[PDB]
Structure formats: structure tokens, C-alpha cells
Structure 1
Amino acid sequence: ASMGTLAFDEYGRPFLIIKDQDRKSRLMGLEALKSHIMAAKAVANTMRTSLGPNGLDKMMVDKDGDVTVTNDGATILSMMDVDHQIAKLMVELSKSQDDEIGDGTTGVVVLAGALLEEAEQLLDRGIHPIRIADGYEQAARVAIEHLDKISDSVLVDIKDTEPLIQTAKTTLGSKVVNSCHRQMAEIAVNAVLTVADMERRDVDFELIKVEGKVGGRLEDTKLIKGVIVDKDFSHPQMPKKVEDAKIAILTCPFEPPKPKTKHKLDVTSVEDYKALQKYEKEKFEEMIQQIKETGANLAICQWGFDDEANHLLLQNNLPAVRWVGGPEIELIAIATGGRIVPRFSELTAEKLGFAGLVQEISFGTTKDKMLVIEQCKNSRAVTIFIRGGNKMIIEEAKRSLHDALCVIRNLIRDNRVVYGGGAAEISCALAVSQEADKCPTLEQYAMRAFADALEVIPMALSENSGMNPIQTMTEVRARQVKEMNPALGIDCLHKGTNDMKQQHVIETLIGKKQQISLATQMVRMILKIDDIRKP
């Protein structure tokens, strides 16, 4: 049953087929499926305690000892050091949910674990696993159709951000930033709405810069309609604040020009030496005067520069910053409305950006200075500056804000929402159960198991909130059947009502559909495996 086959032939002579066959292992048939289901159940049960507003974080430590306190399912599974292949499949499922949607990376794992757990008892009764997979696919189609049916539409206008704010708040409710919950949702919504193509087109996350710095308080996190640069004015005696700055973006180092090709300049006489010295001095003066002629008040370079250029810039009342990174150059050019100029001779007034205020920012007793460019006219780029009391909450706030931005992006793509709190899962389970009654008996078991697996999310929310899972879920389902209201869910926060619509617990329909689809496909793929051949 293990290690494969071993006979050494019926004639005694050696019988070796596969290299190192005595050192390899093999699991076949039903026990392989049981082992896979057990591993997936272990992963899902580990993850399910971090589901909902009352979820608890997992403290992940990598190989170098660095600590990552987090609640994101995809991050937890990514940093988890697993060796089982099915656990790796779970990790990849979470990564897929994170990439496609950005939220619900924990619900997919719990759903997959529940599906495999039900499939275990289905297999114990002699049902072919392919039949279970087919029934799961049928029930998933039914559930997706039901979600589309019970979905609701919201307005994604910029003059009314209340539904967007509510959706972002629902996304952030399970994270540590729920103390600054409304401010976080506000800044995420404003960031996404600022940088987006309004015809339901994509949202370029490269235009959202998420920057973190320790110190201050978490409430100090703010959205800046500009660029926050990790640099400062090159000369220490330059003014620290420039207002109504005419910005010149340059990618040419403020140095004498140098050909790219292998070049040698020959000095053959004293006159040649004097001419070379004069050429150096004149090039410095000429580049500075060319920058000044455009009327610019501030210069940004990408490749740094030398002492003569620095003092010439200071002498002409031209604040400047050097060694600004390429992406930061692009962001500054986008925000300020100025073009990127590759050399001084091509610099004109019309290529200058505009910033209402450029300032150098200190951070207490730390000697670190960071540049701020803001008050642009029609900035198409934003920066989220995150403060905190330690680096760990800063990283957690970064990923929570990323979740909120992803959710608003999904709303931009499709403006159909479904009320969460387990209401969607309960209604889907009810629809699946109703459709299973009309089904012929054989697939009925798979569909019923799918409904029972869908029931896990409200039960996990109930147990995480301290309530009795089965009683609460049963009562909520009975209320959903009695009165036509697919919005009744689990009162995780004990607000006194079961209706998620008044509680404004809002989830994107795309997220739920992706959750169900991905979970069903991964469960089918795991059910189809019946052989393992690890070394």
C-alpha cells in the first residue's frame, strides 16, 4: 500500500523498474483522498478562527525571525511553511482569490475545507468522487445564479460616496484599523475615485502609492493628493518650503555631458587645458541659466549632481532635490502636470509642472526628512501616508488599505452588491436545497452536501462572536424562509438586529461569485487526484 510495488521477480533475479523505487512512496485509491481531505480540513480549521469582525490575528514568523501580525488569509497562507501538496494548493487558492478580487481570501479556504469535509462522508457511502465534483459544480451554478438574482446595485458617483464608504467599512471591519474605521474607508474611497478611468474601466494601482513611516498615531494616516518623496533638498541651506512652485522634472544629471560611446578627449597643449577648464565652467553656468530661464521655482533630478551645480542652484534661489527614483519621477510628472525633460536644451516653460506647496517634513527626533508635493491643480495620482506606533501595525494597515482599495476597484468594475454577514451564504444554501429536491436522488446528496458546506460561514461567524453556532444559524435560516428577506445574517457585533441592510454590511457580488467559483474548482481538482508519488 506504500512505497509502491516490490516483488524482485518470481525467479529471484532483480526486478527494478523505477530509479530509487525503494526510497519513494505511493498512496493510492481512497486513503489518498482521505489524507488530502484531512490536510485540507486542518488548513481550513486553522484559518477559520480569523473570519469576521471578531476574527483573531495570526502571528507569523519567517525564517529570519521577523514577525508579521496579520489577519489577511492570503498573507497568512503565503508565509506558512507547508510541505503537504494539498496545503500548497490551499495557499495557491488564497493567492488566486487575492489576485482576482483582493478580499475574501479567508472565506475561500473555509469554504473549500467544508466542501472537502462533506465530500469525505459522501465518499464513505460509496459515491464516486467524480460524481461529488459534478454535484458540486451543479450546486455552484445554482448558487451563482441565486447571487445574481438577489444582488443589489449601488451608485458609484463621486458626488455621493456613502455606499462606497459602507462597502469599504465592511471590508475593513475585520482588520486592526477598525479603530480608525471611517477615516480609513474615507481615504480608500477617495484614493480609488481620484485615480480611475470613469467609464467603468480599470484602476491603475501604480498610481496609488502606499507609504508607511513609524511614529505619530494611526489616526494621523491621511490621503495626499500628490506625491510623498523620501528625499529632501540637496543643499542644507535651501528653503524648506516653496509655494506655487513651478516644477522642472529632469532626468539629466547636472554634470558636464558625457558621450555613451567609448570616447577619449586629447589635451595636447596648455591652450587645450585652458579651453577644457573654460568649457567645464561654461557648461555648469549654462545648464543652471537654462533651468532658470524657464521661470521654474523648483528642480527635480533623477541622477544626482555635484558641488558646483549645487551651489549654483542655491545661489539663484532655485530649490532642488536629487536622486529621485524613476517611479517617483513618473508620479511627480503625473501629479504636477509637467513633462519629463531628458536634457536642459529641451526644457521649456510649457513642460513645467505646478504644485501649490512643496515642503520638507521632519519626523521628531529622527533626523529623517521626507519631501511633500501637494495642492496640485487636477492631480491624477495619490499617496497614502500611514503612521503608527510600530512597524507591524504599519504593515497590517498597509494590507488592510490594499483590501479596501481592491474592494472599491471591484465596485468600479461591477456595481452589484450582496449583503454579507452570512446572509448571502444562507440564501444560497436555501436555493441549493430547494433545487436539490427537484433533482434526481443520486446528485441530491452532493447538492445537499454543498448546501451544508455553504452553511459554514455563518456558523464560523457565530462561534467567533461567542454565540451558539447551530442555534443562531437555524433561527436565521428559519427567519429567512418565513419572511422574504435574503439580507438576514449573523449579528456579529451584537447590534440587536439580524438585518444586514440596516447594519450596512455590504459585500461585492463579484467577490462572492469568485469565492464560490474558485472553491468549487479547487475542490473538484483535489477530488480528482487519486495517486501520490512523492520521493
Structure 2
Amino acid sequence: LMGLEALKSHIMAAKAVANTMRTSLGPNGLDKMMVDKDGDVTVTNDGATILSMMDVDHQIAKLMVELSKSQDDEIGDGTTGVVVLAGALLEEAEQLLDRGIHPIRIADGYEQAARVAIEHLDKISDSVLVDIKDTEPLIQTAKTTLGSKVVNSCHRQMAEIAVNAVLTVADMERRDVDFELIKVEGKVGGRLEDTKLIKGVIVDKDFSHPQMPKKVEDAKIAILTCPFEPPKPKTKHKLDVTSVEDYKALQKYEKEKFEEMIQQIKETGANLAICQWGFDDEANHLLLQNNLPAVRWVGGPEIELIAIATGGRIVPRFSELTAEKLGFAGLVQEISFGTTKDKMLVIEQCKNSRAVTIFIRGGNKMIIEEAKRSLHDALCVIRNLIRDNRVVYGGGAAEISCALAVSQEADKCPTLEQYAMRAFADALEVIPMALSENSGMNPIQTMTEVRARQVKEMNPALGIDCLHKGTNDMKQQHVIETLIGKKQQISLATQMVRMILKIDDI
């Protein structure tokens, strides 16, 4: 099969993946089941995973997932919308090619309609930005993340932690700021409300040193990796002493290595000390008698991340015990590891912004992974909102506003691209179409109702209801999505159509 018939079958396969993804749109998205090679199962409506985890034995479907992945971090929530919009564009292009239009012509028509839709998106702008006072507007924007997924209590704390982390990690806020370094961490355990923002790194610690000062105002930190007690490079070490007084000589050597070095280190302004491996608690008793708060069991990647956080690089031997080599913290504080049953000491490094991370807890592995994806999406949307302060009303409102714009613009040209832009219009219409399909209300009735509301009254903030608030205006609903986010979604959809609309593959 070659030519237009091969492209017809290819559009059929693209529709096969697209309508499968269709039901997952929006906050009210219907979930999907994934069973993997490992045999595990998970319920999830987030598009990014159910493309990445999904595999389809067709090359164009592989390009679908690859091109969605390429803008994964760039567009978090859109992972569903871009794919469904590309699918609708291909479904309309099916009819367009059945009418005989050559594929690059409709591709360029889609590009022209993309330009028109982008310029129309420019016309809607909100979200005045000032970093200190933005807290309330930004948590109202993160209300979209809060009210959608399983967070029924809609914790304002997670919205606040995300917005404060993103606003603090870069002091300059005008444009294209370096929000690449931040990341979120989490593990199964306590409630979802068990969260804490750190201007540094949280370490993992064993429950020795029980009542020791886990909180110290250490401006500087001892990053001494030398073994205070016999080391273990995957290889254990041995002990051999002639008598109990020989072991007491070993004790006084240990006392030299503890009091003398740590007196020097405190002279350099550090009390907290790292150890690369722990051996036994009777050696820890000397450290307790020295009132030492210390942590250990840091892995290779763990200790390297500690180094990048504290700016100091590891000290393996005695001769390198100087102030300059050890890493800085400025402050250290201690916070419960779980809810209350276990405790953790956390090292902030506030004097440098190069390390800010978010810790979250969850009552289940499904709960923790859902929190991972939800907080990643919230981080993405807040990042993309503060990168470009302009915003547009979501809930399908922006897509149908662009639908009106490009459909009314379709009469502006004499060339074949007119049907291409009309196809773009009734394909942008799919977002409320499918967003009501996966919701309860009748798709076309509500879609055309809000579409005509945008004509009887000029405000483009009208969209379909997705949380049953009883109102079709999205301004009070505040289901809002970043303007540059919408621009990226539409542009990626147009490119994603183009990259398989001009294909006559083997």
C-alpha cells in the first residue's frame, strides 16, 4: 500500500490511538488501565504515563509517543489534549483527503490556523504577577490541580509549597528562568499532608544518635568521608587486639580521631559530620559521649548530590581536614520522617539557590505515585505560568475561542487551505466534545451552547462545566491554563499532525 491509501490506513491507526486516549481529557478524565511487561497494574488518567507506558506496534504511533515525550516536561497537562487534538485533526483530514486535497496543503492550512489560533490566544490575558503577593493568585491557579485528582481536602499546603519553591529557586523572574534543577521526592508512609519545603536536601538517616542535636545552627558542615570505624567498600573489615588494655589503647586512638578532629572542625565552624559506613553502636557510644549529631549510609549518588548541594567535595583522608574543603549549610533543622513515628534531620543550604526540592508523603504506592504525577504537573504549570505571566481560561474555553477565530478567518483566503482551517476549527472543537464525552453532559449540546454563548456575549471565558459547579462561565470556576501552555499545546498538535501528515513511510 502506497500513497493516499497508505496515508488513509495511517490516519486510521492514529485515530486508533487517539480515540483510545480521548476519554482521559481534563479534570474529569476517565481512567485507563495499564498492564506492563512486569505484570503490574495501575489506574491513571495522566496522559504522559499512558503514552510512555503504552506501546503500539506501528511506527507512526511510535512517533506519536516520541513527539509527545519530547515536550513532556515542557507541557505537563497537555499530554492528553495535544494527542486528542492531533487525532481530531487527522480525523477531519481523512475527509479532506477523501475530497482529494494533497497532504502538504492541509498541513500548511493547519499551520496557518495554528498562527491564527495563537494570535487569538494572545487576546486573552490575566494573572497579574508580583512574587510576594502572588501567593493567593497562584494557589487559585493550582486549584485546578487540587480539585481534579484524589486530593479531596484540596490541601492549600501543596499549592503553596510548589509556588514558594518555584518563586524562591530563581530570584530573577522575568523570563526563561532556570527551573530545571528542582525536583520532588516522596515515599510511601504517612498522610499526603506530610510535606515540607527544603532550601537544600533531605538526607536519609538511621535511628542511632537518638536524643542528639539533630538541629544545629551549623553554617559549615563536615563532609569528612574517612572511616571513623572500619570501612566497607562492599568488603568487611576485621578487628584483632591483644588484651582489654590494648582495646583501651584503641579507644584512646579513637578519642584522638574524634575529639581532636571535631575540635578542629568546630574551630572551622562545623559540628554535624558524615561517615561513609557505620559499623556498630558501641563505637557510636563514644560519639554520643562526644555529643556528636552525625549521619551516615550516604550512597555514591547520594553523597554526590549532597556535595552539589553544599558545594564542598568529599574528604577521604586526614590531610584534607581544612575549612575550605568541607561543605556549607548555613542552617540545619529536623522534621518528622513520617507523620510522627519517625524523625529526620534535614540540611538546608539557603545561601545558594542551586538546590531546592520538595518532600511529600503518601499512604500507598499508588497514592505516592499519583502524588508524584500531580505535583509534577502542578510544578510544570506554575513554572510555565511564571515564565510567561499571560494566561488563558481553560476547560475547553480557549480551544473553542480559537475555533471561532480560525473558523471565521477561514473565509479570508481563496486557496485550498480554507477547508484546512475549517477542519482545524471543528477539530479544536473536540476538546469540549471529548471533555463532555468523558464527562456526563451531552457533548454537542453543551459544546454548541457555550460556542453560541461566546457569540451572544463576547467574553471568551465560557467553557463546559467539568466539576458540576452549575455555571458555564470559567472565570468563577477558575479552571485556568497558562497562555503559553495553550500555545505550546496547539503548536505541538499542529507539528504532531504535520510530522505524520507528510509521511508515505515504508
What TM-score comes out, normalization by structure 2 length? 0.85
Q: Deviations over 1:35-54 (max 9, x none)?
A: 11111111111112111121
Segments of 5+ residues of structure 1 without an aligned counterpart are: 1-26
Closer, same or farther: CA 280–169 of 1 in aligned 2, 3 Å? closer
Corresponding residue for 1:94?
68
Structure 1 residue 144: Cα displacement: 1.0
Go from structure 1 to structure 2 and tell me whether the alpha carbon gap of 1:258 and 1:408 turns closer, same or farther (over 3 Å shift): closer
Q: Report the CA distance shift for 1:316/1:73 in structure 2 as closer, same or farther (over 3 A).
A: same
Residue 272 and residue 189 in structure 1: after superposition, are their counterparts in 2 closer, same or farther (change >3 A)? closer
Whether contact under 8 Å (2:127, 2:137) holds in the other structure is no
Q: Aligned equivalents of 2:234 and 2:99: distance in 1? A: 75
Change (3 A) 1:181 1:109: farther
Instruction: Pick which of 399-408 and 361-370 moved more.
Output: 361-370
Q: Which whole-Å CA distance do the structure 2 matches of 1:259 and 1:118 have between them?
A: 63
**Equivalent-residue separation in structure 2 for 1:277 and 1:476 (angstroms):** 81
Give 2:155's match in structure 1, choosing from 181, 184, 190: 181
Q: What is the CA–CA distance in structure 2 between the aligned matches of 1:369 and 1:254, rounded to whole Å?
A: 24
Give the equivalent residue in structure 1 for 2:365. 391
Deviation at residue 194 of structure 1 after TM alignment: 2.5
* Contact 2:200/2:349, CA 8 A, preserved across alignment: yes
Q: CA deviation at 1:186?
A: 2.1
Question: How far did 1:268 drift?
Answer: 20
Residue-by-residue CA offset, 1:366-385 (whole Å, 9 max, x unaligned): 99764434697887744433
1:79-228 → structure 2 map (5 Å cutoff): 79-177=53-151, 179-200=153-174, 208-228=182-202
Give the counterpart of 2:316 among 323, 335, 342. 342
Checking the alignment, whether the CA contact within 8 Å between 1:288 and 1:309 is kept in structure 2 is no
SS state at 1:178 partner? coil
Structure 1 stretch 292-301 or stretch 401-410: which is displaced more? 292-301
Q: Hey, what's the Cα distance between the residues in 1 that align with 2:384 and 2:446? A: 31
Shift of 1:66: 2.4
Match of 1:308 in 2: 282
Corresponding position of 1:430: 404
Alpha carbons 2:170, 2:177 under 8 Å: kept: yes
Q: 1:33 Cα deviation (Å)?
A: 1.0
Change (3 A) 1:257 1:495: closer
Shift of 1:188: 1.5
Q: Deviations over 1:52-100 (max 9, x none)?
A: 1211222322211223332221111111132111211221232123132
The 1:111/1:162 distance shift into structure 2, 3 A limit, reads: same
Aligned with 1:373: secondary structure?
Answer: strand
Residues 386 and 510 of structure 1: is their aligned pair in 2 closer, same or farther, counting only changes over 3 Å? same
Q: 1:272 to 1:461 in 2, by over 3 A?
A: closer
Q: Is the 8 A contact 1:58 1:71 kept in 2?
A: yes
Please say which of residues 381-390 and 72-81 is displaced more in the overlay: 381-390
Superposition deviation, residue 178 in structure 1: 5.0
1:281/1:515 CA distance change after superposition, 3 Å: same
Q: How far off is 1:437 after superposition? A: 1.1
Relative distance call for 1:97 and 1:209 in structure 2 (3 A) is: closer
CA distance in 2, matches of 1:500, 1:330: 47
In terms of mean alpha carbon deviation, does 61-70 or 121-130 score higher? Answer: 61-70
CA contact (8 A) 1:245 1:298 kept: no
- Report which stretch shifted further, 421-430 or 111-120: 421-430
Q: Please say if residues 117 and 402 of structure 2, whose CA atoms lie closer than 8 Å, have aligned partners that are also in contact.
A: yes
Q: Displacement, 1:116?
A: 0.3
Please report how far the alpha carbon of residue 344 of structure 1 lies from its aligned counterpart in structure 2 after TM superposition: 5.7
Q: Hey, what does 1:456 align to over in structure 2?
A: 430
Q: 1:395 deviation in Å?
A: 0.6
Match of 2:210 in 1: 236
Matched residues in 1 for 2:358 and 2:238: separation? 48
Q: Secondary structure at the match of 1:371?
A: strand
SS of residue paired to 2:122:
helix
Contact 2:55 2:62 in 1 (8 A): no
How far off is 1:28 after superposition?
Answer: 1.0
Identify if the C-alpha distance between structure 1 residues 348 and 512 changes in structure 2 by more than 3 Å, giving closer, same or farther.
same
Matched residue, 1:20: none
Q: C-alpha separation between the residues in 2 aligned to 1:455 and 1:262?
A: 66
| Residue 132 of structure 1: how far off its partner (Å) | 1.1
Question: How far apart are 1:501 and its partner, in Å?
Answer: 1.7
Distance in structure 2 (CA, Å) of the matches to 1:350 and 1:312: 27
Contact 1:195 1:203 in 2 (8 A): no
2:333–2:345: 8 Å Cα contact kept in structure 1?
yes
Corresponding residue to 2:474 among 500, 508, 511: 500
Whole-angstrom CA distance in 1 between matches of 2:244 and 2:469? 89
- The Cα of 1:456 is off from its aligned counterpart by 0.4
CA distance in 2, matches of 1:214, 1:505: 30
Tell me: CA distance 1:424–1:361, structure 2 relative to 1, closer, same or farther (3 Å).
closer
> How far off its partner does 1:168 sit?
2.0
Shift in Å, 1:299: 1.4
Q: Which has the larger displacement, 283-292 or 473-482?
A: 283-292
Task: Note the alpha carbon deviations across 1:316-358, whole angstroms, 9 max, x for none.
Answer: 2112111324665566678789887676655567888787986
Alignment partner of 1:290 is 2:264: yes
Q: 1:234 to 1:202 in 2, by over 3 A?
A: farther
Is the contact made by 1:170 and 1:506 (CA closer than 8 Å) also made in structure 2?
yes
- Distance in 2 (CA, whole Å) between partners of 1:407 and 1:30 is 39
Report the CA distance shift for 1:132/1:178 in structure 2 as closer, same or farther (over 3 A): farther
Given that 1:29 and 1:531 are in contact with CA atoms closer than 8 Å, whether structure 2 keeps it comes out as: no
Aligned residue pairs total 506
**1:123-162 C-alpha deviation (Å, 9 max, x unpaired):** 1111111111111111111111111222335314123322
Q: Does 506-515 or 233-242 show the bigger shift?
A: 233-242
1:445-488 deviation digits (Å, cap 9, x = unpaired): 11101101000001112222211111111111111112211111
C-alpha change, 1:348 and 1:466, in structure 2 (3 Å) is same
**Contact persistence 1:233–1:320 (CA under 8 A):** no
390-399 vs 501-510, greater mean Cα deviation: 501-510
1:412-451 CA-partner distances (Å, limit 9, x unpaired): 2111101111111111111101111121152211110110
Q: 1:267 to 1:63 in 2, by over 3 A?
A: closer
Distance 1:261 1:104 in 2: 49
Is the 1:335–1:379 Cα contact (8 Å) retained in structure 2? no
Which has more radius of gyration?
1
- Cα deviation, residue 210, structure 1: 2.3
Deviates more, 1:47-56 or 1:104-113: 47-56
1:392-426 CA-partner distances (Å, limit 9, x unpaired): 11011111101111111112211110111111111
2:234 and 2:349 map into 1 onto residues whose CA distance is: 39
Quickly say closer, same or farther: Cα 1:240–1:281, change in 2 above 3 A: closer
2:341 paired residue number: 367
Q: Residues 178 and 101 (structure 1 numbering): CA distance in 2 closer, same or farther, change over 3 Å?
A: farther
Deviations 1:183-219 (A, max 9, x none): 3322221222232232435565575452323232223
How big is the shift at 1:503?
1.8
**Which consecutive unaligned segments of at least 5 residues does structure 2 have?**
none
Deviates most, 207-216 or 49-58: 207-216
Report if the CA contact (8 A) 1:71-1:175 is conserved: no
Answer with 282-291 or 187-196: which moved more. Answer: 282-291
